[PDB]
Every structure is written in structure tokens, then in C-alpha cells.
Design a protein around this ligand. Structure first.
Ligand SMILES: Nc1ncnc2c1ncn2[C@@H]1O[C@H](CO)[C@@H](O)[C@H]1O
Ligand SMILES: Nc1ncnc2c1ncn2[C@@H]1O[C@H](CO)[C@@H](O)[C@H]1O
Ligand SMILES: Nc1ncnc2c1ncn2[C@@H]1O[C@H](CO)[C@@H](O)[C@H]1O
Ligand SMILES: Nc1ncnc2c1ncn2[C@@H]1O[C@H](CO)[C@@H](O)[C@H]1O
Ligand SMILES: [K+]
Ligand SMILES: [K+]
Ligand SMILES: [K+]
Ligand SMILES: [K+]
Ligand SMILES: [Mg+2]
Ligand SMILES: [Mg+2]
Ligand SMILES: [Mg+2]
Ligand SMILES: [Mg+2]
Ligand SMILES: [Mg+2]
Ligand SMILES: [Mg+2]
Ligand SMILES: [Mg+2]
Ligand SMILES: [Mg+2]
Lengths: 380, 380, 380, 380
């Protein structure tokens, strides 16, 4: 009656995550001066290069060189010895205004509450009572392992560490009436970029004793836990030099780690009129509100939109059998309590605030009491 | 006892799909001369620009200008009036060899069968008996609507059509003992790029009569079906001019349309040593083999890997209650019948063959009897 | 006692000249809002691509997409059939602020009159009484042949013409006491981009009858004049698709066509603190003032600078024996009448005015009564 | 009876010279495998970026990443502390085949001796007996000052030096019957990039004692010589980070330092069919042959071409009055002794040999006994 499930996470210096952070740094910079900026900023990273590509219509005056370079500095890529340096990399910009055809279809001449969805699409929200963060344990652990790497790099404990890292956690679970109950960590993978001087045994020892043991509750570890620590044997070349980065290339890391579902919409570099972002945030908020309200233990919420249309086209609720209420009753509760138009979500979740760079590593969900992580008290 | 579910698809000229097709055109070109080419080719598209970024180690001599431009020609972007032209766009290349640290960790000096996974990661396979293609109806319909658009453009029936299109289908379902049974199409969205001369009513009439009616079985349509046809009102600007494209930005379109799950791994531009591609293909093959073998009606398969390690770290099977066999029994059957090392999958699925461009629109699954769509006869 | 001399010119759509015009369009846009903008804008052109590279510190808010695209529209590249289209090309920007090390060395905290030269360098000015424009006949004719091409393209007389063109004129001269006296046109070359429909004989006939005969005074043409008209035989591919363009790649076309001398400094995309521009303009002004003042018939002026130093390091005057005054006397006259500090030249020549795009085809000298073409009355 | 004249030179790490060296490295790499490669490679450099733009048709298999990066390594940009690093910069490639319209006009189906000029244009050759190298003293000194900088950097004498440098020398001359006779160095400018630790007085002292005194014969220096050493006061930011680089942006540095004349044709990145290179080299060879043959002391040679035509359109010889022979007699001698078709020059000067990178700093003329610097014995 047990099953395995695996999730992964990446660190701040993973090339895809560099792009997500830069795109959201660019978005925040616009929003700081123009709360109504229309932003759709993709970032591409390869050896020595940050390229911004996409569409921005805004009143803000933004110094892209500064914004990009400060983001890469925060990540820690500050010397050619590390494979990338904010001081001396190439920053190229291919940014145009938003298509006027889109603008006229979505928001021009509309009352804010009634703005159309910025695109079509489908979005899911998920919550699970298995952790206090209402998130899968597999992904929560994976994220914390990367955060611990960054901490130890930054505080000088493990000065051989670089910014690019990946982690993966397999948990063995049992189920109870459709809820899931973690039993033990089955397998942990950690790969992290490193300097030329440190040997593999020192790294593997440090990853076990200073990272894994510092993060994973000991009740979940036993003698049969499998560790794959620096399994490649060598990871000196890293960041964009080792592997190309794109914005929106970590959508599963950003969300639920393989649990629930995903509609395909990336978050980073988009203002609230992009329902890929605002409706996914709202959907998480719905799902979390249902669980923390005691109406279910686990729940998946789907919504979907058409470009130019303000109201969702479909809402669906799946409770995995973890409620005494029917799924149709939960749907009636959601419909009574939430207004999932983007022009209303923006007010409920304060989505014109320039806090997006903070979302762009370690997952958008399950941390920091962002507005979509504060449950709505439900009337029913 | 009914529920709604929504999936989307995009056409060949959607800017993300242009990138996926180009990346796979580049991969095929390498594989045509060097079956063992190591390829990790991302493509970025914006107004007038195709950029290739990533890592390729190969013996092939490839003319990137020709390969890229022929792919964009096939898609149909051949004049500045359409917003993009293969004859005159910019093709920029930022391609390096594969990192030697990766190469030494994964494949150098290894027997082919025992090559390590090209990366860590998690991958799901899904199959459902609701259609002959073993795919969700929502996504199958969405894909066929885009294919019909392309057909009508190409044959000159609707010469006002351009290549960039999106579709979305919401089906109303009932469930039966964990299987799903489609009842009716609830909502259809179609947005498609068009010329400056055609009016909106002509387009909406054509989308209803020549596209939707030609594709959706009439038993699924009724008087309450909701149509959102060119809901933006105007879509003259399109392709990379309207919206930036990236490779791997359509991973849900490429797979199961929101059903099942996704581990986050994009397919296009990667050779078989990238388990994001090979293991996802194998997982689909497993799932399809279970359903077509009559062991379940619906099934989700997870596998996961570590870089440099040949065997999967975890396998999990979820049958939604649609089998008399336990999930653990299905897992024992999968373990008996499949070898999910990448160096074995490559032989079973013939993944050195240059057929990848064909996968890169209209979904990787549910069509054309690709090798991963031919069920394995199971011993148990 | 005769000699041949050859000069060339290029048209507005020659890829190097596209870059010069774009760089000066960018400069003008800055100067329109911030008269003290520091601008060093290089432009690179290839198939489908305009890249801006360089350094700009300015208070202006400039829409590079608009500025670039409007410049390419003015040139006439507006359809993929012509090989380039302002509507749909890629505009990439790699622009940073001026180096603070340069800024502190040249202008920060300085009184305007005493700003240092923006760089080291040498610059020449030249004037010759052989034409009313005080320019060599060879280059004046070459420029007018390109201007006539553009006129006939624009007015629809020769609608098969495209924007990319080159011309070259060889004149046979005699000398008189160091002045030069044109006798006849020896050879004319014209190459111009064209459509796919027009045949070579129609083009060659039109180039002779509608272009050459319309431009070159008939006294200079005879039966032995050699014509090389579309000598390549085919010129359908042109503009940046046929040949890469760079700013500052037409410095001889921009100046004296091989006569006099050149110190190596390009003009386009630079504000007045760049002495490559301001001192060359001043030097032309000196040379023209000497000739129109009747102090010589032909004259070459050299000046040179060091970065951060306001006054020139060297001034030299060479009159080819065409004055009764010694060269040292002409030098004393120049020193009495001109102040060749950049912070003074800017006032004399009004070099903060946004008129630079107009300079960037058909030569910077010998036309339009620009301020450096209005002779200073000399005191001596 | 004296006059001043100024020339400049730049060092190997000047951003324009980086581009010239890279373009010629790319050319050499092609020529190493395919002696008939058609190459027209421009290079653009800015912070963190090397872009190759242009046209190459060749049978060679060239690894642009290696070729570019090895060239930047040779120059000395190997750490982010220096502002640029060959290990980690971005190398972008926008290279297409040669235009088929050009190819058919110039060389396809032609006997090699009779290939047409690769373009129209004018080119000058110059030689002067004032130095053993037959070059102006002003430019020879400027080049040697940069070479001494590189030597002292490379051998560790002045380890605070970086690769980017500029120099400028003003010589006071007298004339003798049209020959020029250097008397003294009037002014020297040196600007060189440096580390953050060295103070200005140490630099200025070293530039005087270790560079200028090591290079300039003491007979040319006196107490009135003016020195402008690090005149900006600070030059820590340098290379492509301080200033954009382009190929062909140092054409006066590459040739005669302001003496003689220039037709506008850049050398680097072009195979011999580009007469900008081959005919300029031949013209230098003619001029040097005239002087070393004792037919004049100083001489300027002009030639010019039309695209597709093998023979020059015009030849002109100007001896400044430094011969007893008339200019027309020298012209008859040149015509008797030289064949200035590009398909013949290639044989005389061995221009398919991959030695071009060596030409791309410190001037193309006056050094190393390149074939165009070995005088032809003249028959007359
Ligand atoms: N040598 C290596 N060993 C393990 N992981 C690596 C290595 N190089 C890169 N990676 C990580 O895996 C991803 C894909 O190659 C990169 O973004 C990086 O985070
Ligand atoms: N004006 C429009 N109306 C509807 N869809 C559009 C429009 N412009 C672009 N799109 C589609 O939506 C996506 C996101 O803007 C694009 O890739 C494109 O396919
Ligand atoms: N086929 C051709 N015939 C003549 N001139 C050309 C041709 N193609 C390009 N050119 C011109 O010559 C230059 C160098 O190839 C280009 O900028 C262009 O102006
Ligand atoms: N701070 C400086 N001082 C002097 N010369 C410089 C400085 N920065 C750059 N340069 C040189 O002058 C050129 C133009 O700015 C550059 O290529 C570089 O060689
Ligand atoms: K990648
Ligand atoms: K996008
Ligand atoms: K060129
Ligand atoms: K520059
Ligand atoms: Mg990735
Ligand atoms: Mg989407
Ligand atoms: Mg997209
Ligand atoms: Mg992955
Ligand atoms: Mg040119
Ligand atoms: Mg200069
Ligand atoms: Mg320069
Ligand atoms: Mg030329």
C-alpha cells in the first residue's frame, strides 16, 4: 500500500532560474514606476550573454543594463572563474511594445474590473495538508536543499560552492482516503557547481552532513535512504556556460513538483493581465482556502480563459475523495466566494506591487505568506 | 456527477511551436549525418529573428541557415505581409560544444546500453481509453482544430489565414469507476492570425462551418455549446512579431493537455541521451501498453533519473481505480517487461532516427504510430 | 601632362550607409530632447537585423524601435521582396552608458569651452576650387549619380530600382601650378540593386540615358568615355542581405573621395565632443574659408588632439603651391581666426542641433550650406 | 620651412583591432583547409560579446568558438578583472554564404587569372625613403610604442598594463625637393588601460622611461618634446567594455597614418578576390618597388576597379617631384612590370596563404618582409 513520488528543484544560479529572476527583476522595475505596465519579458542566457526578448508597453524609464546586472550580482555570478560575471557579460535587448491588436482586444478602453484575460489558457491550483505550507513534501524538501546550498555559499561555510545547483527528492508515501501521508525519504539527488580545487569526497561528505542533515527531518531518513551526491563526478563548468537558460523553463519547479496538474502557463516576466500568472495565483489561493478551511485535505482546481473575455470559461474542483462535500458543492462554494476575473484578482492579491523577483526562485507557492498563500475565510 | 475539463493546442506558426520545429529540424539535420550527435538546441524567435542557443557536439556538417529557413518556409512564413519571412529573417547562432564535464559524467567511455541519464529529472506517461488514440478528447480535438486551420490555409480554401493559431476545448465528462467518459463539448475557443482584408463575421462564420463542424463529431455539439471565435476582435499582427517564441514553452500542448501530470522536461532539440525526451517517450509507451493490453482503462506512470546513472531511481504506477490489479502488480508487470535505461530505450524506440521535426507540432503522443505509440505485448 | 583620378560614392540603401543613417537618426533623437547627450552609437546590419552597439549617456527617452525603423523606411526598404523591411526586421540593442573613466577625463566638471577632446586623433580638412562646392569633381559626380538613382526610384520613373547602389567616376585632369583642372570623364561605373523582372539591356540603357546623361555635364563626356553599367550582370540580392553593413565603413565616401587625406575618424553616431566629427567639420570649414577667401586654390589642413586636452596638439597647412602666401603665413592666419577647441567649435557650428541624419548620405561636405560649408571671413 | 605631421596607432587590445584580428583569424582558419574560400567576415565587439557578421562560402569545417576565443586569448583578455575574457564571453554568429549574384558576377566559371574584381573601388599605395621600412616615421614610431607596451605587459615588467592602448606621434619635418626629412619628435600621446592598483605617477614615469625612451631614437627627442601620458587621468575600463569595436575601423592605422591617401577599403576578414585587400597590397608593392629601385624618393599610386572586371580601370602615379622621370614615364614602367588583375596578384603575393592574422595589428605595411614588402626588380 505504499508508493514512491519524485520532485525536483533548482538553485538560484541554474540557468533557467537566472532567466526567471531577470524577467521578474525587469517586471518589478517597470511596476515600481508604472503600476499598469504591460510586460511580457523573456530572458535567454548562454555563455556571456543575457538577451531580453518580448513586449513591454510602459511609462517607466528602466535601465535594462543595471536591472539585469544587479539581478545576476544577487545570484552570485561575479567573476569569470565562476563561468559568468554580471560586470562583464553581454546584455542584449530585443524588446518592442505590446502588439496593438492584443492591447485593443484585452484592455484598451476597458474598466479595470472588466479587462479581458490577456490570453486564452488553462491553469490549475493545488493544495495538500501533508505539510504546514500546504505543499507536497517532495518539492518542499527539494527547494530547501537548494536554499541551504545558497546559504552555505553566501555565509562562507562552503566557499567552493557556485550558484548553479539541482536537487531531487523521492518520498515513499501511503494514502489515506485520498490524502497522502509521507513515510520516509527514499532517494536524494544533489548536483552543484563547484571550484576546481575541492575534491569529490569532501563535496559528498559536506552535501550529506552540512546540507541533507541540516534540511531533512531525521524521522524521514534511515539506513536504506539512497544518496546520489555529485553523481556526474565533476561540475566545474556551470551556469549559462554549461547549459542554456530560458524564462519559463522551470514551470513544474515553480509550482507543484509533478503533483496536481499544470496548464502550461509560465509566470515570470508577466504583469497581472497575463492570466498565466494571475489566475494560477488565484487558483492556488482557492485551493489553499479550501484545505485550510477544513473542506478537504487535498484538492485540484482548474480554471480556463479566452483572450479578451474577463470571466473564466470553466471552473473544476477535484478533491480526491478527501471531503464529505461533493465536488459540485465545493464548486458552488468557490463560485460564491471568489471572483476570478483578472481585474478583480489584481485587487485581491495586490498584483501591481513590484514583488515578483522574490517569487522567481524556490517556488511561487508554499512560502513567505505572499497574498495567494493567505487563505480566504469562506462563506457557505 | 459531471465535470468540465479544458485543454489547448497551438498551430504550426505559433511562435513557441516555430521554435520547437526549428530545434527538431536542427536535431534531425545532425542525426542524418551523425546518429550519435549530442544535441541540446534551444531556439528563440522574435520579430525578424531566429536565435539558436545551446550545445551540440557532432560530426555532422550542418548549414544552420538552410535548416532554419527551410523549417520556417514549411510553416508558411514567406512574406513580410505575414509578419515573418524565411527568405529575409535574421538567423543568429550561439552554439557551443557540450560541456566536457557533462560528457564525462554521462556518456564518454561508456557502453551504449549503460550510458548515464543525460540529466536528473522526473517524467510521466499517461494513457486513457476515452479515444482510439489513447489520449484525452479535449487535447485531441484542440490539435485537430489547429490541423484543419493549416489544411485550409495550405489548400487555398481560406486564403486569409496565416500560420499562427490557438485553440481550446472544454469537454463535459462523467466518470465511471475512475475512467472518464466524454459527454459533450461545452466551450470552443479559436484565435487565428489573418490578413487585413477579411472581416470578422466572415472569419467567425468560416471558423464555425469550415473548421469546428469539420472536426468535432456532431454528437458532441449541441445548442448550448459556447463558441469564442476570434474573441480578441483583431489578430493581424502575429507569429514572432506579436509574441516571443521559445523552445520548450509548449510542454503541456506537447503531452496531455493538463491531464495526468508533467515532470517539467521539454522535448524538442534534444537527442535520446536527454531523458526528458527518451524517458517521457518510454513512459507514454508503458502507459499505452498497459491500457491497450487491457490491464487498465486509465493510467499515470512516473519515472525519475539522476545524471550519470543509467537506471531509473523511482517507478510509480497510478491506475485511478480502473484495474482489478493492484498498482503494485502493475508495477511488477512494468518492471518485468521494460528496461528504462536510455541506452536501451534508444534501441526499442529507434531514437537515433531523424524523425523529430514531425513530432514538434500537434503533440508528441496519440498520432502517426510513432514507435512509442505501438503497444508492447506484455508477459505476466 | 594629364592624370587620372577616381572616386566612388554609395546610395542610401548601401548597407554601410544604412548604418550611418541609423546611427545619426539615433543621435538626432537624443539631441532633440537632450542637447548634451553623449552618444557613440554603432550600427551593424545583416539579413533581417539591425544591431545598435555602443555607449549613450543621455536624459532623453528614445524609442529605438521607432527611430531605427523610421530610418529604414525613409531609405526605402519596406518589403521582403526588396531583401529588407523596416516593418518586420529584428532591431537588437547593446547600448551602455559612456564609460565613467572617459566621462571624468573629458567633460565632467568642465566648463563647456574647455571640455577635453573626446579622444585622441588626427583629422584633415580639404577644399579645391575645381567646383562651386569646393569639392573634387570625381566625388561630386559620384554622389549626384547615386542621388539621381534615388530620385528616379522614388518618383516611379524606374520602379525596378532598389535602394542599394554604388557609383565610381574617373576624371582626367591637368594641373596648373598645383591646382587641378578637370578635362573629361574617363570612366563611369554604376551598380544598382534591381527587381527580378527587368532585363539587363533595359537597365543599361536607362543608366546611360536617364542617369548619367541627366547628371554629368555633356562637355565632360565624349565618344571615348568608358561605361561599366551593371558590370556584375545581376544584382537582385542587395542591401544587408547581400553584404554586411557597419557604421563608419564609408569614411572616404563621406569626405573627399581619395583626395586630400584622412585621419581615420568616422562621423556618424557621435556627438560634438567626439573630435572625429567636430574637428573634421571645423577643418573643412578652415579649408573652405581659405579657398573662398582667395588665399589659395587648393588646401589640406591637419589638426590633432589628445583625450582630455581641449586645444589641438598640432595644426598644419599644405597649399600645394596654390598661394603666394607661405604655408607658415596661412597657418598664422588660421591661428588668428579660428579656435579649434571642441567646446568652441560646438558654438561656431551649432553642433548640438539634431541635423545629423541629413549628413549621413551623399557626403558630409560640399552640400546644403551646413554651417561648416559657410566660409568664415578672415582677418589678416 | 618646417611642418608638423601627426599619425596614430593602436594596440592589440583596442576594440577595433580585436575585431580585425578575429576576422583574419577566421579567414586564416578557412584558408588552412580551403585555399579558395570566399570570405567577408566582419566582427563586432562590445562588453562580453563577439559577433561575426558577413558572408563565407567555403569547404572548410571551422569551429568559430575555438577560432574566436583563441584570438582573444592571444590578445590577452583572459579574466573578468581585465574587462573581457576569452573563456566566458558570448560568441554569436550571423554568417551566410556569399551572395550567388556576386559569385556569378566575379568568379564562377572563370579562369583564375581572369577572375573579376570582387567589387568596385579605389586603392592607393605609398612609399617614402624617410625610413628603412619605406614608411612614414610618425606611424612607424606610433606602432612601435604600442608593440613595446605589449612586450612589457607580456614579459611581466609592467604587470599593471592591460591590452587596450593608443598612441600618437607628431614629428617636425623639413622637405627637400618633395621628399620629407624628419627633424624631431614634437609631441607624443600614450593612453593605455591599466589595473586598479597602480597610481598615475608610476604609470607616467614608466611610459616615459620604459616605453618612449626604449623606442624613440634619442636624436629625435629634446627638451621641448611634449608628452601627454595617460592624459585622461584614469583608464581602468577598457577593451570592448569601454568602447565598441568593429572590423575595418582602423584603416588609417593599418596603412599610412594620414600620409599618401586612402580609397576606403578595409583589409581584414577578406580573401584575395576582394581587391580592397589584394590591390592595396599590390599598390604598396608597386610603390615600394619604385622607391627601392631608385626611381623616386616618395610616391603615391592609385588603382581602381569595377566588380566583375579583371583589369584595373585607372592607374595613376604621383612622385611629389622626387624623380627625374616624369609621372607618365613611371606609369609606363609600372604597366610594363606589373599585372594588377586579382587573379595574378594572388600568385605574385601568395595571397591564399593563411598569414592574415599576423597583418591585423601594427600595420599591414613596413614590417616582416611580407611578400608586398619585397621590392620587384624593375625592367625599363
Ligand atoms: N557537469 C554537471 N554535472 C551535473 N549537473 C550539471 C553539470 N553541468 C550542468 N549541470 C546541471 O544540469 C543542467 C542541465 O545540463 C544545468 O542547468 C546544470 O544545472
Ligand atoms: N491579437 C491577437 N488575438 C488573439 N491571439 C493573439 C493575438 N496576437 C497574438 N495572439 C496569440 O496569442 C499568443 C500570446 O499573445 C501568441 O503566440 C499568438 O498565438
Ligand atoms: N550582385 C552585385 N552586383 C554588384 N554590386 C553588388 C552586388 N551585390 C552587392 N553589391 C554591392 O557591392 C557591395 C559589396 O558586395 C554591397 O554593399 C552592394 O552595394
Ligand atoms: N578612460 C580612457 N582614457 C583614455 N583612452 C581610453 C579610455 N577609455 C577608452 N579609451 C581608448 O580610446 C578609445 C575610444 O574611447 C577606446 O578604444 C580606448 O582604446
Ligand atoms: K537548456
Ligand atoms: K511569449
Ligand atoms: K561588408
Ligand atoms: K567605437
Ligand atoms: Mg533547462
Ligand atoms: Mg499559455
Ligand atoms: Mg509562449
Ligand atoms: Mg529537466
Ligand atoms: Mg562595406
Ligand atoms: Mg579615432
Ligand atoms: Mg573605433
Ligand atoms: Mg570598398
Amino acid at each position: 500500500g505504499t508508493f514512491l513520488f519524485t520532485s525536483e528543484s533548482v538553485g538560484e544560479g541554474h540557468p533557467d532560474k537566472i532567466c526567471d529572476q531577470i524577467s521578474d527583476a525587469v517586471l518589478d522595475a517597470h511596476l515600481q514606476q508604472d503600476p499598469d505596465a504591460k510586460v511580457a519579458c523573456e530572458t535567454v542566457a548562454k555563455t556571456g550573454m543575457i538577451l531580453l526578448a518580448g513586449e513591454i508597453t510602459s511609462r517607466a524609464a528602466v535601465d535594462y543594463q543595471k536591472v539585469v546586472r544587479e539581478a545576476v550580482k544577487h545570484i552570485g555570478y561575479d567573476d569569470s572563474s565562476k563561468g559568468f560575471d554580471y560586470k562583464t557579460c553581454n546584455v542584449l535587448v530585443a524588446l518592442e511594445q505590446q502588439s496593438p491588436d492584443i492591447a485593443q482586444g484585452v484592455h484598451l478602453d476597458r474598466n479595470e474590473e472588466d479587462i479581458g484575460a490577456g490570453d486564452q489558457g488553462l491553469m490549475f491550483g493545488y493544495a495538500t495538508d501533508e505539510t504546514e505550507e500546504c505543499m507536497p513534501l517532495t518539492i518542499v524538501l527539494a527547494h530547501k536543499l537548494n536554499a541551504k546550498l545558497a546559504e552555505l555559499r553566501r555565509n562562507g561555510t562552503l566557499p567552493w560552492l557556485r550558484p548553479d545547483s539541482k536537487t531531487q527528492v523521492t518520498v515513499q508515501y501511503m494514502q489515506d482516503r485520498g490524502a497522502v501521508l509521507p513515510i520516509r525519504v527514499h532517494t536524494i539527488v544533489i548536483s552543484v557547481q563547484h571550484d576546481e580545487e575541492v575534491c569529490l569526497d569532501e563535496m559528498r561528505d559536506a552535501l550529506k552532513e552540512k546540507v541533507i542533515k541540516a534540511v531533512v527531518p531525521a524521522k524521514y531518513l534511515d539506513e536504506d535512504t539512497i544518496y546520489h551526491l555529485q553523481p556526474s563526478g565533476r561540475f566545474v563548468i556551470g551556469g549559462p556556460q554549461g547549459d542554456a537558460g530560458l524564462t519559463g523553463a522551470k514551470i513544474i519547479v515553480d509550482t507543484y513538483g509533478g503533483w496536481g496538474a499544470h496548464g502550461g502557463g509560465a509566470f515570470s516576466g508577466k504583469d497581472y493581465t497575463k492570466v498565466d500568472r494571475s489566475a494560477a495565483y488565484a487558483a492556488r489561493w482557492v485551493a489553499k482556502s479550501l484545505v485550510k478551511g477544513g473542506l478537504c485535505r487535498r484538492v485540484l482546481v482548474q480554471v480556463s480563459y479566452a483572450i479578451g473575455v474577463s470571466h473564466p470559461l470553466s471552473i473544476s474542483i477535484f478533491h480526491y475523495g478527501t471531503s464529505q462535500k461533493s465536488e459540485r458543492e465545493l464548486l458552488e462554494i468557490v463560485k460564491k466566494n471568489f471572483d476570478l476575473r483578472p481585474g478583480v484578482i489584481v485587487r485581491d492579491l495586490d498584483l501591481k506591487k513590484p514583488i515578483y523577483q522574490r517569487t522567481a526562485a524556490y517556488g511561487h507557492f508554499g512560502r513567505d505568506s505572499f497574498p495567494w498563500e493567505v487563505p480566504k475565510k469562506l462563506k457557505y
